[model samples]
Target: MNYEAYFRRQLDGLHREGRYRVFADLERHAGSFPRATHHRPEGAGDVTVWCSNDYLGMGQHPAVLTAMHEALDSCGAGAGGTRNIAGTNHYHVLLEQELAALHGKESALLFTSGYVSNWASLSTLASRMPGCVILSDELNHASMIEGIRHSRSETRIFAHNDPRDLERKLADLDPHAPKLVAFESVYSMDGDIAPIAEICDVADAHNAMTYLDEVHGVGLYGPNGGGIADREGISHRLTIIEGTLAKAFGVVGGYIAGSSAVCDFVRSFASGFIFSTSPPPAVAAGALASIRHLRASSAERERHQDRVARLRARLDQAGVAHMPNPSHIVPVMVGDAALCKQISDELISRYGIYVQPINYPTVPRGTERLRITPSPQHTDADIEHLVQALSEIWTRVGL
Candidate 1:
């Protein structure tokens, strides 16, 4: 009775609360990344993407494209099945091996996406381990939270990036209970780096397993693009290191690297891994090329940082308000959801800059922002243009 009415009501709530997400209509141009065509009702126009997940512009790199093209020609369109069934390709094996080696782990298991990797592996580990307790960071990503929730295990929320709080919470739990400490290395929304070593030290003291969601850190931090854990020389301290190939790797899929036994346990038991069709051979090949390139060449990372730094410096000079954080992410805060969306629209329509407004559920209610990720492909002139546009809109619409 009135099922459609109920559905409408639910969606209406999203609109009323300013939580309804609107994605920018963007078409990626081959070999011209950080510059996508913004498809609008009026007309199609080229726009400089200031907020893309393609951090290092590796998505369109020649090596990555070449590998993908080769794989597509050889392996065709699909992986054909799940990892368990007839789906696992030779590329998958190579990718996993390279992932494990990158993180200094004994093994690694792949999933369809970083979300699935977190959701499936955490759920499996937490549910299977008898009386397991998971202490998650308050600001951990939705993916990690959903995974922990799906497990139905006893859970505790610790303050974000606070090792003292985590340790205190862990101390209150049953000493002999199987416990897992879950957090992210780079909090995507805030662009803050975690106190990874401190958290690891606490987890070690509590005899709890550590699961780090490095989706934002991998291929952006480490000398070899392994991850923040790799950059900080703390990779071995984690029980499981979760990351995405979609981010800096500029391909697709998620993975967890750990000791052989731990990875094997997740690989064998995870429903997400067992049932879902694996990524296509070409995606694996592309990811492989990207990883290899990043591992050997710090040129991309160096350029990426320089771009980010210049943008921040320019924003500072212009007196444009942005959340100051150590990472490459530049989050320009707009507390009001409607105002945030308005600023985003104005940026695109008036200045041809496209940085989507991050609203509630992605971030706290009063912390709405435009999460900008500058890539290496951005020229110094681009940074100047972006800052000027941002300043203009901010002055016009800011409360």
Candidate 2:
């Protein structure tokens, strides 16, 4: 009957069901991905991590860290005030300029995180598109979902990665109404690029403004790493582009680039952006360095794509089952939520591969899996070990 006991009992039930997880501490080497670790009755050991979002291995890049350290020394700890207050710095403006250039837009605005970027931009679009409707992809990240929900506009849900469905939705929209097609170019968990040109064409026909979330694609795609749209050559058609520095950029912060008027409106209406303290100067400095590095280096993007292809091809050749993502993400579907966790646990405990088991809510019910991210730093030997371990586990688990 006690409230505390009731909550404790519910959490205990989650643990029993294998849905509870504890993030292990990672003692990482700078250039290499961190070796995850946990304490147990036996002893201390290491886990070879395969579940990081740092797609290009830039999180530990010397340039990014060096800039961060230098900025910390010069700029001190925090922004200490909101962007409109003392928080705005020279670095923030520089990063914003660089971001706009990176996305081939006239201007850009920064947010503390990618989630808020989505929330602010989409909600702003919704408000501006008075009597407008939003056509959103079904598999978008939660941030986009919240923004769409908060926009308080009539919304149409399109099938995941399905252009035909989007076309149908576009046809159904009010012709006089402002329409926006909101989507992520590369779905993080899916590892697939959206049909960029096709969607843009649909948007063009329907007089819809195109809004893209390129958080997973930026700093990892194209010769310039401008993201999937840029790689595909349809950047001009996109009305707004949202990207994050935390992923492939290997830093922290997010931005939306487009017409200056759109950004200005969002800056005024976006509660999440206007109310929040801006990212520290060090973050902006780190992001600038990372973006500069990405702009100058196409080899890193190629290497990352090569790694994705190599990993995916190996999984196919070995007859190991996984999500058919044509890009960087690879998810080994381990059905049954409990079994999924067991597989991930066994892989770490016995095989030393550190893939996290994704279950319901994160994915969908019955679609639990081990989502993997491979970087250029992973060697042939690492691939061999992964294949060997997975093959062995597949058989041992009677899959």
Candidate 3:
């Protein structure tokens, strides 16, 4: 029973299965979107990055960065203290108010990151709700999964996006039980929008609360970036709406917007909320600016969707194997893990069209893929180049 030998064996297995990953050491260029610098293991070279979460091209937006720079000038680097203590700043209040309004909620509470938002909020609710039976989606993000693990309550995971399965799970639970149905609006990996109303109806029938994580969909979906709940006309039905500033908002930190009681309760009780330093003032400021921009610009969202649609069309015309995605994510499926990595590496090194390989643990083993994020900044010509390069690479590798 040598632990070291066992660990090495597992590593060997990962390597043999083509699941081993090496970092590209990439840094994105401003305004150019995914075209960035990649530090190869061999040395350095210009690399075109394809897998980035900056959906609306706001990461390099002049307004957002200006907000960040102004905050730095006025407030310095870190909060330097926890929220419950001496770290709460003017930007915190401003961003929370803006976020609450964005989601049509009475209040909002911020966390250090989106992952922390899920982990803390769910775990806190599990403790607070008496006789709580958590209903979760099987295909939720890892952060949501971790939150469920931390909840220390009985949980039933329903089939991915299947309202019938959720209803079935709810039927067996106590009719009077304090329960919650947790799901995401747009699942990040597959880029598929959730069936929000059907799931909400299931929760309603079971007399359970609804927690919707709209991290990927926020600032990218719905009217004025309000997310799927608003898009599907179910915003008020949700008890919680969790979102992140890092992705489309092009900043950092996460927040939950809902009833004031919910925000106050989590603020007072959630350990992750009380102990961590508040997000840097600059981060909150940047988020505020980005939120305003999202609210004001319908064209930005349209441009992003157009880019995604174009990429989807090109992939379809070329007969590429990709996941069924309706959002900004376009996944090029490679069933074998080893082949996935090889394709990713070669795409970076040879074609200059960068995309991250989605392999086991991130996605199911048999559904390994190359995840392409076509942002608003991707020009029509850029997409054509990507299509051409992918066609060449796919044919050369006999994919």
Candidate 4:
């Protein structure tokens, strides 16, 4: 029972497989959205960030910051306890109301993160429905998979974005069985969108509850940033609509909007929700401000879409191999894990560009690549520099 040897062997395996991760130390500059300070062994230097999830640059928005400051001044810091125990700040209540209205739902519940919201809600729903069966997407996020597994339900994996296959699987299940169809509105890594209307039609025909994770779609899609559901006019079809405040909203938190009963069930039963400390008042205030701002303003979302188009056009012109998808996410192919890491490192070291390497477990093996995200704040010159850097690196790395 040598614990040291066991731990060493595990890490050794990761190193051998080139799966060990070393996170970059980056400090983003205020007012300069894409430019950031990269901490290196040599010293800190400037780098252009291309992998941030702050999709709209709202994290640095004046209104969001001001709201956070006002909240901090009014309430100080930290939620004293879990939401059930003196942690329900007024900001939290307001944010929930705003979210419900945004998604056109009766109610909404918040979690510490989008991951937690997925894990907690799915697991709780599955557990409550005795003999429940979850029809999940083969390419669902790890959080969704983890939740389904934790639920210990009769789970079936359908092909990614194949509603026909989903229908076939749903048909095979017991007619009277409690069932849930879980998936994402936008596949984050590949940036492909789901056929929401088609999926909803199948779910409705089979009388199966539909759970959609709109983390990537919310605050970036639809007229009011209500995500793909609102965009497609299928908001009423979904049993639950999960979203994140961290990405396009440019704050930190996760929420699920649905009927009041469903919200109450998860709020009362989910262990992840019951025991965890609620997010600070300032964080909620910031998220509320961002959400409200995005709901009224279309400028950031429009700018983000423009940048995505520019980046893809640049990639095509540069002859760099990139997987094409309709969403804002841009993934450049670099087939090997070690090569992916090498490319990422060189981009930072030689080109002062920062893009995280997408490796195994995040995507399938041999499909490792650089997941690039372009924000509105990145100037034309900045994008041109990134395009040229990637082109040169592709040749330099012989990829």
- TM-scores, all models, native as reference: 0.97, 0.94, 0.95, 0.98
Task: State the weakest 10-residue window (summed lDDT) of model 1.
Answer: 390-399
Residue runs of model 4 more than 4 Å from their true location after superposition: 397-399
lDDT per residue, candidate 1, 223-262, as tens digits?
A: 7788789999989899999999998999889999999999
Superposed Cα deviation of residue 309, candidate 2 (Å): 2.4
Instruction: Encode model 4's per-residue lDDT on 262-317: one tens digit a residue.
Output: 99999999999999999999999999999999999999989999998998898898
Worst 10 residues of 3 by lDDT: 17-26
Candidate 3's residue-wise lDDT over 118-196, tens digit each?
A: 9999999997886799999999888888888898888999999999999999998777899989999998778899999
Question: Compared to the true structure, candidate 1 yields what TM-score?
Answer: 0.97
Clashing residue pairs in candidate 3 are 18-338
Candidate 2: stretches off by over 4 Å: 1-6, 9-13, 37-43, 364-366
lDDT score, residue 37, model 2?
A: 61
Candidate 4 lands at a TM-score of: 0.98
Candidate 1 segments exceeding 4 Å error: none
Ranking by lDDT: 4, 1, 3, 2
